[PDB]
From a paper:
The ORM1-dependent SPT repression is largely relieved by LCB2a-ΔN5 (deletion of residues 2 to 5) or ORM1-ΔN8 (deletion of residues 2 to 8). The LCB2a-ΔN5 and ORM1-ΔN8 variants were inhibited by C6-phytoceramide to a lesser degree than the WT AtSPT-ORM1 complex. These results suggest that the hybrid β sheet between ORM1 and LCB2a strengthens but is not absolutely required for the ORM1-dependent SPT inhibition. The flexible ORM1 N terminus is consistent with the greatly diminished ORM1-dependent SPT suppression for the LCB2a-ΔN5 variant. Together, these results suggest that both ceramide binding and the formation of a hybrid β sheet are critical for stabilizing the inhibitory conformation of the ORM1 N terminus.
Author numbering:
A (entry chain A): 63 to 480
B (entry chain D): 11 to 156
C (entry chain B): 5 to 36, 41 to 475
D (entry chain C): 1 to 48
E (entry chain E): 36 to 62
The structure:
């Protein structure tokens, strides 16, 4: 038993590390500062730029019916709701928006979230607990893997969009736990991958889940509103009934031009999330003027289905004009609105490759007035997919500035790569 | 230190031993009054109703009814979660000496007649054995082991 | 206060017995999921089905008006044997005692909203991009300069959610090999942020600085649990004011100990940034703590400024590091532009830079109203928690069946309150929070006090002698 | 609401009867009445 | 017989109610 004098010396000898490491000169860069909008033609520094870095795939930023819908909500409710959904934070527009969403998709019930990132790190820990088994894709983004880590269950990974690997992994799990037959099992995937721009092959995941009795959790942020014939996501793109997917989540910062997220499914599942979640019970509810714009956007999408035809033509045209690139290679699916350019024959270093892309984005913005986005990964990120440059093409881009983003990007690759 | 588990932290506030005893006196008065009988046949019913409820609540169910703590106690009964697992504390001693005291009352009032003595001794032995300090986290022949 | 405990335990035991009895038949009449496992096991939500569903009309009440001093409450009328309460028409005008607009910024006012609308007319409600890509506008650049020169730190960052500001920032600061010591009553966002990192978590007794030192010495003298390695870091987390309790932290005593043992201080002040303080600068201005003695300072824009979001304030190096490695800054969508104009204008009104005197009257009314209400409750016999200067003040009920009785008797006479029970509190300690606003008038508070006196006579919650 | 009707209300919320179903409280109020007559009748003869 | 078991149990009671609390070791 230590005497009280020894503990004093022990506490005086201990020396801690700094709160943050020293800031090196290569990690203090700044992004552009916009004015006037974030549409296809925004304004930076007094010059006119062409924007390929915002994810409004339908071209709804700055629509007349959204301004008109948000003004009336701001003149009647104010800006905030002042509390969570369980203490007088339920305004009646929240109840109208959940109904409008589930009538569009064709489900019984919906639930709304105030932050688009929180809809996945609060949903996965709500269903999966310590003894369960989750099978994930390895390519999922940081919001999914944070929710995977917070739920203390066992996580197994399969290769990116590879169905042979998924079948092998499912058979392997259905031999290790053959004893306890009352096992909770989930498959976690993502409709269009943010880190690769590839589309999940859903008609086969559904065949495999019905064979080993698994449940699917799907993240439809980059597919909701763009990918079906009528806009209802990936399920009607592959012609599978929405009832076979158990949980469907989405974020409203893409293609609806809003903020927030939702989840959709049974009346039994949605009613359990309302009482034991984390970003729903211990957070304030969505400002009403943001929920009043989602209702109008869902109406505009539902009445105008030629926007979804125009988006596909824009994507195909950018593919036609960008196929002679020299040091890069297109590694995205031909339907997705996230065009992903890869770097062939990397320089070798994990941090010398990023410098080249960050340099070739800056030159594009400086010389040709283009906003493109390059990969920025946190040290907490566990994704090991290749890095590259992404373009978010929208229905609002014209054919004039669509071959301006290929002619300006084929010129910096034949001059800065080899 | 503070307990940080809603499944057990409530057992340290005042009035809990007193309510434990009052429930057992109220049960005896109810058994006597609803069906006229003798004190011994009422203390036997109390003694055997205190076994079914207590064994199922303390030594059979595993986990917690609160899901915030994802599954951190899935493999533990309520008795094993008590006091963070520390043995022979104050509340554990009280919960151990209650069935022993309740056995003597049910035996001395029934004149040690056999039809009931077998049951009243079996209950006490099973209840006291499950509370031994060396019987922690051990399942017999795998029952309730997963 | 002894027979109250005995009655509380008795009533909870009765609820437990009846719930188990009904569950033993439910799980037996199911013999009169095609290989799929159940969503939730039968006893993993026992108190949601057997306790919370009994008192369901006391929660999630819809309102059809703005959250002001008075509002309109929609009524619900479930038909299917009380399973799904669905709403009707025909609202009723109530007095608001349950929202969080401490300074009265939660409706239309004549300075803020006109400037909010013309910012929306120009930036259109969202950018659909992250801050490092295309989500930085002029408004976002000006908001951080306003937050910096109002909190009192070299630099600041703004996020779009206040739960995420904890649960995504704590993992960036500490990892496996570090220690976190936390107050027993910290918010869920802090606990989830601490679990999101690999660090070890220890806890100390609520608001007792003599136990914090006892924990620090024992943890430093030992090292990491099995291999007595030195700890890399220690971070101590406290809150400016605790809403369920209504009390203010013992911050000078915490900061004196943390300097002695070389720990870092993380301060969460979401219920105190606008409410308390002579000029509304929070707990550091009230308790005279030097703002250079805390390393990270966090806040929310929901309780006083009538908006959404959160912030971190610290030094230049901390902010430069976060803007390079933080998942919320790199991956999320930026805070909406009309919702940042709100915070800019609210700070201008409080600081007095709108060219008016409303910002000082708000601060003088919130101090005056809550003192009067708290001093009036205590002489009637209620047990009221809180220190003296808080705007939140719970009332002890103790008995689980006194929650619906109190709530339903107040609502029938047009007063709206919040009540909380077991799962969210300790077993013995159900209560009702009261939130006072700077927009409440004197002849509203007299009406509320007159109603609450009558209701407390009937329920019998006057546990102390009157005057 | 007079004195007796008031004290009954207080009893209901003090012992949890207020937030139960009609038959659940019916099964308890009658079981308490059965217990009361037993005590009031084995104190007038047993101790006499 | 009817009063020896009572003493037997009273002995184990006073043996139990004197022990000092402890916690199990680590690995
Ligand atoms: C009607 C008057 C009383 C009726 C008798 C029924 C009361 C039985 C008490 C049950 C104690 C439960 C202890 C642990 C149970 C765990 O298994 C479960 C599942 O993990 N924990 C939970 O659900 C969360 C814990 C919350 C339980 C507290 C609510 C009940 C509080 C009762 C007051 C405490 C004093 C009694 C202590 C134990 C008394 C044992 C009952 C005696 C048998 C009566 C037969 C004559
Ligand atoms: C320290 C701290 N951090 C975060 C929050 C919630 O942040 P938000 O209002 O930005 O969601 C609260 C209040 N939390 C509210 C929910 O809105 C409540 O449940 O009472 C808090 O006290």
């Amino acid at each position: 038993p230590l005497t009280e004098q020894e503990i004093d010396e022990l506490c005086d000898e201990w020396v801690p590390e700094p709160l943050i490491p020293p800031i090196t000169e290569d990690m203090k860069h700044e992004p552009p500062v916009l004015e006037s909008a974030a549409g296809p033609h925004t304004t930076v520094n007094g010059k006119d730029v062409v924007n390929f870095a915002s994810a409004n795939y339908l071209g709804l930023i700055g629509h007349e019916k959204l301004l008109e819908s948000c003004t009336s909500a701001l003149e009647k409710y104010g800006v905030g709701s002042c509390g969570p959904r369980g203490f007088y934070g339920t305004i009646d527009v929240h109840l109208d928006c959940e109904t409008r969403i589930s009538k569009f998709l064709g489900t019984p019930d919906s639930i709304l979230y105030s932050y688009g990132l929180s809809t996945m790190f609060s949903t996965i820990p709500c269903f999966c607990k310590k003894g369960d088994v989750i099978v994930a894709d390895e390519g999922v983004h940081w919001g999914i893997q944070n929710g995977l880590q917070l739920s203390r269950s066992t996580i197994v990974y399969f290769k990116h969009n590879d169905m042979e690997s998924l079948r092998i992994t499912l058979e392997k799990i259905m031999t290790k736990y053959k004893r306890s037959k009352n096992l909770r099992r989930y498959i976690v995937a993502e409709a269009v991958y943010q880190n690769s721009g590839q589309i999940a092959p859903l008609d086969e995941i559904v065949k495999l889940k019905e064979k080993y009795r698994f449940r699917v959790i799907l993240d439809e942020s980059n597919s909701f509103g763009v990918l079906g014939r009528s806009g209802r996501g990936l399920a009607e793109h592959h012609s599978v009934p929405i009832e076979k997917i158990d949980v469907v989540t989405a974020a409203m910062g893409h293609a609806l031009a809003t903020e927030g997220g939702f989840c959709t499914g049974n009346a039994r599942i949605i009613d359990y999330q309302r009482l034991s979640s984390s970003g729903y019970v211990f957070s304030a509810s969505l400002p009403p003027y943001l929920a009043s714009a989602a209702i109008t956007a869902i109406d505009v999408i539902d009445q105008n289905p030629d926007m979804l035809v125009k988006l596909k033509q824009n994507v195909a045209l950018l593919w036609k004009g960008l196929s002679d690139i020299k040091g890069m290679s297109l590694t995205s699916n031909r339907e997705s609105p996230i065009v992903f350019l890869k770097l062939e024959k990397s320089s070798g270093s994990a941090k010398d490759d990023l410098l080249l892309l960050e340099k070739m984005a800056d030159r594009a913005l400086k010389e040709d007035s283009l906003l493109v986005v390059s990969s920025k990964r946190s040290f907490l990120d566990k994704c090991r997919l290749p890095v590259g440059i992404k373009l978010y093409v929208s229905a609002g881009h014209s054919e004039s500035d669509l071959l301006k983003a290929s002619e300006s990007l084929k010129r910096l690759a034949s001059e800065l790569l080899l | 230190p503070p307990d940080m588990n809603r499944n057990t932290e409530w057992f340290m506030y005042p009035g809990v031993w007193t309510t434990y005893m009052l429930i057992l006196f109220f049960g005896w008065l109810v058994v006597l009054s609803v069906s006229g009988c003798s004190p011994g046949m009422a203390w036997t019913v109390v003694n055997l109703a205190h076994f079914v409820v207590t064994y199922h609540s303390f030594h059979w169910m595993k986990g917690t009814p609160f899901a915030d703590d994802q599954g951190i106690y899935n493999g533990l009964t309520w008795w094993e979660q008590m006091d963070n697992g520390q043995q022979l504390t104050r509340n554990r001693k009280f919960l151990t000496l209650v069935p022993v005291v309740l056995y003597l009352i049910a035996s001395h009032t029934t004149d040690y007649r056999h039809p009931w003595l077998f049951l009243n001794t079996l209950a006490v032995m099973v209840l006291v054995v499950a509370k031994f300090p060396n019987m922690h986290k051990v399942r017999i022949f795998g029952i309730n082991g997963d | 206060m002894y027979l109250t405990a005995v009655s509380t335990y008795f009533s909870y035991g009765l609820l437990f017995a009846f719930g188990q009895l009904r569950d033993f038949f439910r799980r037996f009449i199911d013999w009169w999921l095609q290989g799929y496992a159940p969503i939730c096991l039968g006893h993993e939500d026992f108190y949601i089905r057997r306790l919370y569903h009994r008192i369901q009309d006391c929660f999630e009440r819809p309102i059809s008006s703005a959250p002001d001093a008075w509002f309109d409450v929609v009524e619900r009328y479930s038909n299917d044997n009380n399973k799904t309460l669905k709403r009707t028409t025909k609202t009723s005008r109530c007095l608001n005692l349950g929202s969080y607009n401490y300074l009265g910024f939660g409706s239309f006012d004549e300075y803020c909203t006109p400037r909010v609308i013309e910012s929306l007319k120009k930036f259109s409600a969202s950018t659909c991009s992250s801050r490092v890509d295309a989500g930085t506008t002029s408004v976002h650049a000006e908001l951080e300069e306003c937050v910096t020169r109002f909190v009192g730190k070299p630099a600041a960052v703004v996020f779009g959610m206040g739960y995420a500001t904890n649960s995504a920032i704590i993992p960036v600061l500490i990892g496996k090999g570090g220690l976190i010591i936390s107050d027993s009553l910290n918010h869920s966002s802090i606990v989830n942020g601490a679990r999101g990192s690999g660090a070890t978590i220890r806890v100390f007794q609520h608001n007792t600085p003599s136990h914090l030192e006892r924990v620090l010495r024992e943890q430093i003298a030992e090292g990491q649990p099995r291999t007595h390695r030195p700890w890399k870091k220690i971070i101590v987390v406290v809150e400016g004011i605790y809403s369920m309790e209504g009390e203010i932290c013992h911050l000078p005593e915490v900061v004196a100990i943390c300097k002695k043992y070389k720990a870092y201080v993380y301060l969460d002040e979401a219920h105190s940034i606008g409410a308390i303080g002579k000029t509304g600068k929070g707990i550091c201005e009230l308790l005279g703590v030097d703002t250079a003695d805390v390393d990270v300072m966090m806040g929310t824009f929901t309780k006083s400024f009538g908006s959404c979001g959160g912030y971190i304030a610290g030094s230049k190096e901390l902010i430069q590091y976060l803007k390079h490695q933080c998942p919320a800054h790199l991956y999320a969508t930026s805070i909406p532009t009309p919702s940042a104009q709100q915070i800019i204008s609210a700070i201008k009104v409080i600081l007095g830079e709108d060219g008016s005197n409303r910002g000082a009257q708000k601060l003088a009314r919130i101090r005056e109203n809550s003192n009067f209400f708290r001093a009036e409750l205590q002489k009637m016999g209620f047990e009221v928690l809180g220190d003296n200067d808080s705007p939140v003040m719970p009332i002890m009920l103790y008995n689980p069946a006194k929650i619906p009785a109190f709530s339903r008797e107040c609502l029938r006479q047009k007063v709206a309150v919040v009540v909380v029970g077991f799962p969210a509190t300790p077993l013995l300690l159900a209560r009702a929070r009261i939130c006072i606003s700077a927009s409440h008038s004197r002849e509203d508070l007299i009406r509320a006090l007159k109603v609450i006196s009558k209701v407390g006579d009937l329920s019998g919650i006057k546990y102390f002698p009157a005057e | 609401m007079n004195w007796v009707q008031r004290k009954i209300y207080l009893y209901n919320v003090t012992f949890g009867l207020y937030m139960l179903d009609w038959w659940e409280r019916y099964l308890f109020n009658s079981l308490v009445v059965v217990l009361m007559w037993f005590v009031l009748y084995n104190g007038t003869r047993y101790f006499s | 017989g009817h009063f020896f078991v009572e003493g037997l149990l009273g002995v184990v009671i006073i043996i139990l109610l004197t022990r000092k609390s402890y916690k199990p070791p680590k690995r």
